[PDB]
Design a protein around this ligand. Structure first.
Ligand code: Q56
Ligand code: Q56
Ligand code: MG
Ligand code: MG
Lengths: 302, 302
C-alpha cells in the first residue's frame, strides 16, 4: 500500500544523454544510434534570440561548429540537419547503450517522467503532466534544455518531450522528439504566455480511486449523478468535460473498487462544492490531477 | 524555476538489482561486487513468520537453497551468511556494473530516493523522508522487499535503506544495509505499530525558502521571533524543536533570500496559527516537510 508520485526508472535514458556545445551555448542532446537530437536554438547567439532565422543560422554552420561530449569521450559530428525545432547531428559512433525506443506525441492530460540534465549529466527524475494548455509544471534551470520526457513500456522507451523554454508564469514548454512544439509556442525569446489552464477531470477521478484503494473513504457518498449534470458542475469549477471514453478508461478502477464512475463523480461534485473541511486525501489538501488512470493501476496492483 | 519532488537518477542502482528466491518466497537483492544483500526473512515459511528463529532457519539452509537471477543469467551462490536482519549471499561472479558506493545509516528527517522493484526488476523511483518515528511513507506492494533507498553524491551511491515490511497504518519500515532496523521494529509478522509522528521543522523552513526563491511571498511578514518563543509554538503544533545546528544548516538559504532564519520562523508561526485561508505554497495546501535544506539547494541553484 501507499501512493506516491512515481517516475519510471531512468537508467535507459541516462545512457543516452550527451552535452552539445555550439559557440558559448551548451545544452543537452539525446544520443540514439548514430544521431544526436537537441533543441535547434543551440545555434543561436544572444542577439539572435529575439527573432532568429534558423535556416540562415544553420546554413552558416559547419560540422566542426558542434562539440558533442559523451562523458569524457568527445564525439565527432559528421552531418547536421534541422527538423522543425530540433537539430539532428549525425555522429560517427552509434550509441552502444541505445535502448529500444519510440518517438510519440502525447495528448494533454497524459503524464511522463522527466530526466533533468545539465552539461550532459543527469541531475534528477520527476513526474509531469502535459497540461490542457500545453505547458508542463517542471523544474528547470538554465542549461536544462535538451532534457527529455519519456514513458517506459516493458523494455521500450517512448520519448515524448524535449525541453526548450520557460514561460513568464514559471511553467515550461517544449516539443515532441520530431521538434513540433506542444501548444502554440515558438522557440524565440519573446513575450509568450500560457493560456488559462483547466483541471484534468479524468485524472482527479483516477486519483480518488487510488484513495479508495488505499483506505481513504470519508469523501464517498451514496449519491450517483448523470454525465450531463456532472459536466454542468465541471464547467463551473474549470474542469474538463467528462467523456464516455474517459468513463470507459476508468472501467478497471471502477470494477476493482465496486464504485461506478458516475458514483465517484457525485463525490467529486460534493468535494468541489464544499471543500475538504480540514481533511486530506492521500496526504494532499487539494484535488490532484497529475495521475492518469494508467498511473494508478500501475502503482495500485493490490 | 519550478520546484518538484525530485529523485536521483536511478541507473547506477538499477544495474545492481537481482531476484532472490528461497522456497516459495521471492524478493529483491542488491548485487555489489560478488555479494548479494537481501532481507533475511526470505528464508522464512508462512508459519515461521509469527516468531522465527533465524539462526536455526539459516543453519538448515544450503547454498543451493538460494536462487539468484540477474536478468536471465542465473547466478551461482557459493556462500551465505547473516548480519543482523540482512542475508549476504556470496556469488561466483562480481557485478560488472557495481558503482562506487557506501553504506550509510541516516538520521530522521533526511531524505533518499527509493527504487521500487519486483522480481529483480525496477518498477519506479520516488523520494522519501525518514520520519521522526523511523517509518517512511512509501509505496510498496508484496514482492517489493529488498528494494533500496539511496542518495547519490558526485558518482558515489550511498545506500541507506532496504525495505522489509508494512505497518498497520500503511507506512513502511526497514533497515540500513548492514541490516539494523530503523526504529524499534523487528522482522516478524506480529502487531507492531508506528509511534506518534512529528513534523520535521527544519525541512518545513527549507521548503518555505524554496517558495521564496520561486516567487511565493504572500506568507512573509515583517516580524522576527526568538528561538525560545518559536519552540513554544512548535511544541503546541507537534513540530520538532528547532536547534542552533538547524539554524546554521539553513544559512545558505537564508543568505540567498536575505531572510534571517528567525524571520522565516515568524512566518511559519503565523501559518500554523492561521492556516492558509485558501492560498497555496508551491502548489500545496499543506506545509511540506520532506525536503531537506540540501534538497532545496540542489534544485534551487538560481
Ligand atoms: C535552455 O536551456 C533554457 C531553459 C530555460 C532557462 C530557464 N529555465 C528554463 O527552462 N531555455 C531558454 O533559455 C530559452 C531560449 C529560447 C531561445 C526560447 N528562453 C527562455 O526560456 O527564456 C525565458 C527565461 C526565463 C528565466 C531564465 C533564467 C535564467 C536564464 C535564462 C532564462 C530564460
Ligand atoms: C516483502 O516483500 C513484504 C513487503 C510488504 C508486503 C505488503 N507491503 C509491504 O511493504 N514484507 C512482508 O511481507 C513482511 C514479512 C516480514 C516477516 C515482516 N510482513 C508484512 O509486511 O506484513 C504486513 C503486510 C501488510 C499487507 C500485505 C499485503 C499483501 C501481502 C502481505 C502483506 C503484509
Ligand atoms: Mg457517490
Ligand atoms: Mg517574518
Amino acid at each position: 500500500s501507499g501512493f506516491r508520485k512515481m517516475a519510471f526508472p531512468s537508467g535507459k535514458v541516462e545512457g543516452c544523454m550527451v552535452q552539445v556545445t555550439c559557440g558559448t551555448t551548451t545544452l543537452n542532446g539525446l544520443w540514439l544510434d548514430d544521431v544526436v537530437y537537441c533543441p535547434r536554438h543551440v545555434i543561436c547567439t544572444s542577439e539572435d534570440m529575439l527573432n532568429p532565422n534558423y535556416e540562415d543560422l544553420l546554413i552558416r554552420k559547419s560540422n566542426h561548429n558542434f562539440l558533442v561530449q559523451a562523458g569524457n569521450v568527445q564525439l565527432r559530428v559528421i552531418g547536421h540537419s534541422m527538423q522543425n525545432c530540433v537539430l539532428k547531428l549525425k555522429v560517427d559512433t552509434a550509441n552502444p547503450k541505445t535502448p529500444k525506443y519510440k518517438f510519440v506525441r502525447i495528448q494533454p492530460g497524459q503524464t511522463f517522467s522527466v530526466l533533468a540534465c545539465y552539461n550532459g549529466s543527469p541531475s534528477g527524475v520527476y513526474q509531469c503532466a502535459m497540461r490542457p494548455n500545453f505547458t508542463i509544471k517542471g523544474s528547470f534551470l538554465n542549461g536544462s534544455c535538451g532534457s527529455v520526457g519519456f514513458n517506459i513500456d516493458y523494455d521500450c522507451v517512448s520519448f515524448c518531450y524535449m525541453h526548450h523554454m520557460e514561460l513568464p508564469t514559471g511553467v515550461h514548454a517544449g516539443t515532441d522528439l520530431e521538434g513540433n512544439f506542444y501548444g502554440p509556442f515558438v522557440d524565440r525569446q519573446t513575450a509568450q504566455a500560457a493560456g488559462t489552464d483547466t483541471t484534468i477531470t479524468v485524472n482527479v477521478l483516477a486519483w480518488l480511486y487510488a484513495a479508495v484503494i488505499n483506505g481513504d473513504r470519508w469523501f464517498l457518498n451514496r449519491f450517483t449523478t448523470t454525465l450531463n449534470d456532472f459536466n454542468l458542475v465541471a464547467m463551473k469549477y474549470n474542469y474538463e468535460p467528462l467523456t464516455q471514453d474517459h468513463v470507459d478508461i476508468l472501467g478497471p478502477l471502477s470494477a476493482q473498487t465496486g464504485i461506478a464512475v458516475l458514483d465517484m463523480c457525485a463525490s467529486l461534485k460534493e468535494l468541489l462544492q464544499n471543500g475538504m473541511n480540514g481533511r486530506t486525501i492521500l496526504g494532499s489538501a487539494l484535488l490532484e490531477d497529475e495521475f492518469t488512470p494508467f498511473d494508478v493501476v500501475r502503482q495500485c496492483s493490490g
